[PDB]
Amino acid sequence: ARVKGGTVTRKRRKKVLKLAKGYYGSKHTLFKSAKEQVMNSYYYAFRDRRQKKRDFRKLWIARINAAARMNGLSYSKLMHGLKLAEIDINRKMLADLAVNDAAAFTALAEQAKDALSK
Amino acid sequence: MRTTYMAKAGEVERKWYVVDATDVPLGRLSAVVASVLRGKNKPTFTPHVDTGDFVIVINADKVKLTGKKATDKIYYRHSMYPGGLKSVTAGELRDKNSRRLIETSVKGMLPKNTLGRKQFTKLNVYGGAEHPHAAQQPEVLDITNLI
Amino acid sequence: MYAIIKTGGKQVKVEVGQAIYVEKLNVEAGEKVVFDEVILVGGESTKVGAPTVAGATVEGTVEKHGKQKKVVTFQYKPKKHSHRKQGHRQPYTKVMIEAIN
Amino acid sequence: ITSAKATAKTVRTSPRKARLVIDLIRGKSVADAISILKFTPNKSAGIIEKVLMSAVANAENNFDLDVESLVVSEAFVNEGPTMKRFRPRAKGSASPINKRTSHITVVVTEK
Amino acid sequence: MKLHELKPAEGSRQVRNRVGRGTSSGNGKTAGRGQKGQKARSGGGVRLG
Amino acid sequence: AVPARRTSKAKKAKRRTHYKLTIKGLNACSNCGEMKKSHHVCPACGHYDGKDV
RNA sequence: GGUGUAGUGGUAGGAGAGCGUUCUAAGGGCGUUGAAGGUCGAUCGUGAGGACGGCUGGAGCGCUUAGAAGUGAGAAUGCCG
RNA sequence: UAUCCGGGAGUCAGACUGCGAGUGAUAAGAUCCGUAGUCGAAAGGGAAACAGCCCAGACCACCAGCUAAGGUCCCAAAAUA
RNA sequence: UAGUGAACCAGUACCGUGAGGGAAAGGUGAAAAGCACCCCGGAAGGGGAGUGAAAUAGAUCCUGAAACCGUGUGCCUACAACAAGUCAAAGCUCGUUAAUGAGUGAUGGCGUGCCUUUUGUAGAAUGAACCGGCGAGUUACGAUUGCAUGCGAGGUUAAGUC
Numbered sequence: 050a051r052v053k054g055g056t057v058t059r060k061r062r063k064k065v066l067k068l069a070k071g072y073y074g075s076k077h078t079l080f081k082s083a084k085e086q087v088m089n090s091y092y093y094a095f096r097d098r099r100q101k102k103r104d105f106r107k108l109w110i111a112r113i114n115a116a117a118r119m120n121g122l123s124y125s126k127l128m129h130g131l132k133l134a135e136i137d138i139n140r141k142m143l144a145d146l147a148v149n150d151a152a153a154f155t156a157l158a159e160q161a162k163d164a165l166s167k
Numbered sequence: 168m169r170t171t172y173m174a175k176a177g178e179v180e181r182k183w184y185v186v187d188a189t190d191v192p193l194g195r196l197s198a199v200v201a202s203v204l205r206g207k208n209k210p211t212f213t214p215h216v217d218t219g220d221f222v223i224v225i226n227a228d229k230v231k232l233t234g235k236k237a238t239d240k241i242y243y244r245h246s247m248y249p250g251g252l253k254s255v256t257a258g259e260l261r262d263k264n265s266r267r268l269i270e271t272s273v274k275g276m277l278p279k280n281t282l283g284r285k286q287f288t289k290l291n292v293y294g295g296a297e298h299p300h301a302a303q304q305p306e307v308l309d310i311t312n313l314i
Numbered sequence: 315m316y317a318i319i320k321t322g323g324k325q326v327k328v329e330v331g332q333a334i335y336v337e338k339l340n341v342e343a344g345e346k347v348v349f350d351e352v353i354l355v356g357g358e359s360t361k362v363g364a365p366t367v368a369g370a371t372v373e374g375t376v377e378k379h380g381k382q383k384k385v386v387t388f389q390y391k392p393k394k395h396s397h398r399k400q401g402h403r404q405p406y407t408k409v410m411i412e413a414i415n
Numbered sequence: 416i417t418s419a420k421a422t423a424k425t426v427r428t429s430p431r432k433a434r435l436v437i438d439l440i441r442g443k444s445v446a447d448a449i450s451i452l453k454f455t456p457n458k459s460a461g462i463i464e465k466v467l468m469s470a471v472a473n474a475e476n477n478f479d480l481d482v483e484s485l486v487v488s489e490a491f492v493n494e495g496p497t498m499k500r501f502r503p504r505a506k507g508s509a510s511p512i513n514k515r516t517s518h519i520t521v522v523v524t525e526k
Numbered sequence: 527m528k529l530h531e532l533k534p535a536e537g538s539r540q541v542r543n544r545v546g547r548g549t550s551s552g553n554g555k556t557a558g559r560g561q562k563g564q565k566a567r568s569g570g571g572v573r574l575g
Numbered sequence: 576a577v578p579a580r581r582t583s584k585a586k587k588a589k590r591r592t593h594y595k596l597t598i599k600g601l602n603a604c605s606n607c608g609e610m611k612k613s614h615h616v617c618p619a620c621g622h623y624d625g626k627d628v
Numbered sequence: 629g630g631u632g633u634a635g636u637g638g639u640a641g642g643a644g645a646g647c648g649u650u651c652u653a654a655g656g657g658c659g660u661u662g663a664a665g666g667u668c669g670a671u672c673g674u675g676a677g678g679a680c681g682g683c684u685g686g687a688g689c690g691c692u693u694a695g696a697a698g699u700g701a702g703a704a705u706g707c708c709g
Numbered sequence: 710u711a712u713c714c715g716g717g718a719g720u721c722a723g724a725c726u727g728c729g730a731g732u733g734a735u736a737a738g739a740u741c742c743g744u745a746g747u748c749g750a751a752a753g754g755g756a757a758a759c760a761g762c763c764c765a766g767a768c769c770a771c772c773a774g775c776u777a778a779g780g781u782c783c784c785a786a787a788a789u790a
Numbered sequence: 791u792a793g794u795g796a797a798c799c800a801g802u803a804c805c806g807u808g809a810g811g812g813a814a815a816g817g818u819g820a821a822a823a824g825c826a827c828c829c830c831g832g833a834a835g836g837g838g839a840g841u842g843a844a845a846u847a848g849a850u851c852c853u854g855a856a857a858c859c860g861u862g863u864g865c866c867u868a869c870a871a872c873a874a875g876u877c878a879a880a881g882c883u884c885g886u887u888a889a890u891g892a893g894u895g896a897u898g899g900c901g902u903g904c905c906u907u908u909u910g911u912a913g914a915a916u917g918a919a920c921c922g923g924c925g926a927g928u929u930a931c932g933a934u935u936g937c938a939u940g941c942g943a944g945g946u947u948a949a950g951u952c
C-alpha cells in the first residue's frame with residue numbers, strides 16, 4: 050500500500066505562488082522565496098489592518114485642525130467645546146464637513162466656541 | 168464606507184505668501200513656513216499628495232538669532248573625504264548667505280523624501296525687502312500670532 | 315439635503331437615492347428600516363444634533379445582505395515553529411436611503 | 416496565408432550569441448536583413464541567413480507572397496538540447512562543458 | 527447491518543497519532559521528544575529502574 | 576574571490592545592456608546597386624570606386 | 629436551538645476535533661457527447677482545503693459509510709535528475 | 710479553587726530590571742543566593758533605533774469613540790495653553 | 791528515483807593491478823498508414839503537399855509541471871538609499887465564477903528574510919544556488935492504562951482436526 054507523492058504537493062505550492070503574484074522576480078517565481086514573502090505579507094497585513102485605523106484618525110485630526118484654525122480655534126479647543134455642547138459627530142464626519150461643507154463646519158465651530166464661552 | 172476625501176495632484180490651488188523675517192527667531196519662522204509649505208494649514212491636507220502653498224521669505228538678513236547662536240551655532244558639512252569637515256557659524260551665514268541659512272533651517276523641518284524635497288523647491292528666500300515674484304501676486308502672511 | 319446618522323457604532327453620511335453599507339442589521343431584505351439617531355442634518359441649512367437632532371429620522375430599504383471579501387489572519391512567530399491561520403467574512407447590510415426628515 | 420516561417424532546430428551555436436545577430440535584423444525589410452547578415456562576421460549570421468532565405472522561399476513558393484513587400488515580422492532563438500561534455504582540469508578533476516544548441520525561427524510577413 | 531452503512535460503537539475505535547508531521551499538529555519537528563539529551567535520541571533512554 | 580550572491584535576472588540583463596552587436600558602414604554600391612561597406616570593395620560586383628577590381 | 633455571563637497571545641509539552649493522499653469492501657454514480665492529469669480564472673469554507681467554468685488531454689475516476697496505511701517536506705554541508 | 714488516585718509529558722544552560730546580602734575594588738552587561746516583575750514562551754504604545762525598563766496581554770471585522778505610559782513648534786497626532 | 795542492482799542484450803557499461811565496487815536507460819499510433827511529390831538548403835532542418843480521429847501523436851515521438859531561456863506588450867521606471875512587502879492612493883489600461891471587479895501604479899505611512907540553536911540571532915552564529923522527485927516514531931511479541939463490546943463470580947481457550 051504505497052502512497053506516492055501525487056499532486057497534493059504541487060497544488061499547495063501553486064496556491065502559495067498565486068498568492069505571491071506581482072512580487073519582484075524570484076519572490077513570485079520560486080516557491081520558497083514566495084512562501085517566505087507571503088508570510089511576511091500576512092504579518093504586515095494583520096499589523097496594518099490596525100495601523101490603518103490609526104492613520105485615518107490622524108488624517109482626520111489634521112484636517113479638522115486646519116479648519117478649526119481658519120475658524121479661529123485650535124483642534125483641541127474645538128473638540129473640548131463640542132464635548133461641552135454635547136456634539137457627538139466623530140472625526141471622520143468632521144473632516145468630511147471641513148473639506149466639503151465649509152458652512153456646516155463653521156456652524157459646528159460657532160456652537161463649540163459658544164459652549165467654551167459659557 | 169471609505170469616503171475620506173483624498174486630494175489630487177493639480178486640483179488644489181496653491182497660493183503665494185510673503186513672510187517677513189525681520190526680528191523673527193530663525194526656528195519659529197522656519198516652523199510656520201514648513202507647515203505652510205506642507206499644506207498643514209488647509210483642510211484639504213493629503214499626506215501622499217503635495218498641497219501646500221508657495222512661500223517668499225523677505226528680509227532674510229534680519230532673521231533673529233537668540234542667545235549666542237550668531238557665533239556658537241555651527242553648521243557642519245563633510246565633503247566625504249578624510250578629514251573633510253567644514254564649519255560655518257550661523258552669524259556668518261546670516262551676514263553672507265542668508266538664503267542658505269533659511270533654506271537649511273526649513274530643509275531640516277520638511278520630510279526627507281521625494282515629496283518633501285519637492286515641497287522645499289516651493290520656498291524662495293531673499294535677504295532684503297524686495298523679491299522678483301510680483302508676477303505671482305503673492306499676499307502678505309502675518310506670523311506674529313503664529314509664532 | 316443630506317444627513318449624518320449613527321449606525322453600527324459608526325457615523326454615516328446619507329443622501330436620498332444613495333445606497334450605504336452598514337454592519338449587519340436584523341431586518342429582512344426589501345423591508346423598510348428607520349434610523350432614529352440623526353446627529354446632523356445639512357443641506358441648504360444646517361441642523362446640529364446635541365447629541366441628536368430632535369425628532370429627526372432617516373428612512374431606508376434593505377436591498378441586500380452580504381459578506382465582504384474574505385480577510386485572512388495569519389499569526390506566526392519567527393523561529394518558534396508556530397503559526398495560526400484564520401479567515402473572516404464580515405456580514406454587511408446594504409440600505410438604500412428613501413427619505414430624510 | 417500572409418506570413419511564412421522557417422525554423423532551424425538543434426543548430427550548434429550559442430543561443431545568446433545567435434540572439435545578438437537576431438536582434439540586428441528583427442523588424443526590417445527582407446532586403447535590409449539580407450544585407451545586414453551578409454556583412455556581419457559573427458558565426459551565427461550565416462545560419463540565420465539560411466533560415467531567413469528559407470523563409471522567403473516558403474513565402475514565395477508555397478504561398479505566392481510578394482518578395483519585395485516581405486518584412487521580418489518575428490525572429491527569435493530558443494534554447495535547444497545541450498550536449499554534455501567534460502574537460503579534464505588540474506589535480507585529476509574534470510569540469511562539465513555545455514555544448515549548447517539553438518532553435519532559430521524567422522517569420523516573414525507580407526507587410 | 528449493511529456493508530455500505532457500517533458504524534462502529536461510539537468510542538470503540540480511535541485514530542492513531544502520527545508525530546513529526548508538521549508544527550500545527552503539536553508533534554512536529556521534535557515529535558514530542560523535547561530538545562536534545564539522551565531521551566531525545568533514537569533508541570535512547572535508560573534501562574528500567 | 577567568488578560571488579557572494581547569485582546575480583538576479585534583472586541585474587544580469589542590466590549588465591548585458593551594452594553587450595550588443597552593431598552593423599555600420601553599409602550603403603548602396605554605385606556599380607550594381609547592392610549594399611556594400613563604405614571604403615570596401617563590393618563583394619557582389621567586385622567594383623570599387625566605379626572600376627572593376 | 630435561544631438568552632445571559634465569562635473566556636479565546638504562547639515555545640517545550642498534554643488533550644480534542646478535523647483536512648487531504650493511496651488502497652479494500654459495500655452501495656450509489658460519472659466518463660470518446662471526453663476520465664485522470666496539466667493550465668488559467670475575479671469561486672466557497674474558520675483552517676488544513678472543496679467546487680465550478682475555459683483551454684489542454686485522450687481512458688479511466690468520483691461520491692457516501694466503514695476499513696488499512698510506504699498517508700502530507702522547506703531546510704538533514706540530505707540522495708538523484 | 711484545593712487534595713487524593715491514575716494516563717501522558719517536557720524541564721535540570723536561564724537572562725535582565727527593582728529591592729536585600731555575600732564574593733569582587735561597596736568594579737563589570739561580573740559572580741552567587743534571597744525576593745518581585747518582565748523576557749524566555751508576549752504581539753501592541755513609549756524609551757530615536759534598543760528581548761529583560763515604563764504602559765499594556767493580539768479570537769476576529771470597522772475610514773467609530775475614551776484612556777494608559779509618554780506627549781502637544783516642524784519632521785510627527787495633539788497647547789507656539 | 792518504486793519493484794530485484796537489473797521491466798531495456800545487467801552483474802553489462804564504467805571503475806580497480808586484484809579481490810571487489812557497480813550504473814543509467816520503459817510508453818508514436820488502432821494500424822507504419824513512419825510524411826510519395828514539390829520548395830529553401832551541401833547537409834542538418836524546415837515550409838507546403840500527403841497519412842492519420844488527432845502530426846503542438848514525426849520517431850528527443852502519450853500526457854508534458856517547475857526551475858531556466860526567449861518573443862510580443864497593457865501599466866510603471868533615468869534625483870533615487872529599496873528583507874523588496876503591506877497599508878493608503880492619483881493616473882492609465884481592461885471588463886470577471888458580477889463581485890462595494892481585475893492589471894499596473896506615481897506618491898505617502900509602517901517595516902532588519904526562512905530555519906536551526908540559544909539567556910538572547912536581522913544577525914557579522916548554523917543550513918539551503920534554484921526547481922522537481924525521493925527522504926525520518928514502523929512492525930512483531932510482551933507489560934500497563936484509557937475507551938468499546940461480549941459474558942460476569944466468572945472469563946477464556948492454545949497447539950491441533952475439519
Ligand SMILES: [K+]
Binds near residue numbers: 558559718
Ligand atoms: K512526549
Ligand SMILES: [K+]
Ligand atoms: K479545470
Ligand SMILES: [K+]
Ligand atoms: K535540500
Ligand SMILES: [K+]
Ligand atoms: K499527573
Ligand SMILES: [K+]
Ligand atoms: K534578582
Ligand SMILES: [K+]
Binds near residue numbers: 847
Ligand atoms: K498527442
Ligand SMILES: [K+]
Ligand atoms: K514580459
Ligand SMILES: [K+]
Ligand atoms: K511602500
Ligand SMILES: [K+]
Binds near residue numbers: 915
Ligand atoms: K562561523
Ligand SMILES: [Mg+2]
Binds near residue numbers: 054058
Ligand atoms: Mg514528496
Ligand SMILES: [Mg+2]
Binds near residue numbers: 102
Ligand atoms: Mg486604537
Ligand SMILES: [Mg+2]
Binds near residue numbers: 507
Ligand atoms: Mg593526471
Ligand SMILES: [Mg+2]
Binds near residue numbers: 542
Ligand atoms: Mg490501527
Ligand SMILES: [Mg+2]
Binds near residue numbers: 552553641
Ligand atoms: Mg506544542
Ligand SMILES: [Mg+2]
Binds near residue numbers: 395555
Ligand atoms: Mg520545521
Ligand SMILES: [Mg+2]
Binds near residue numbers: 562
Ligand atoms: Mg534538534
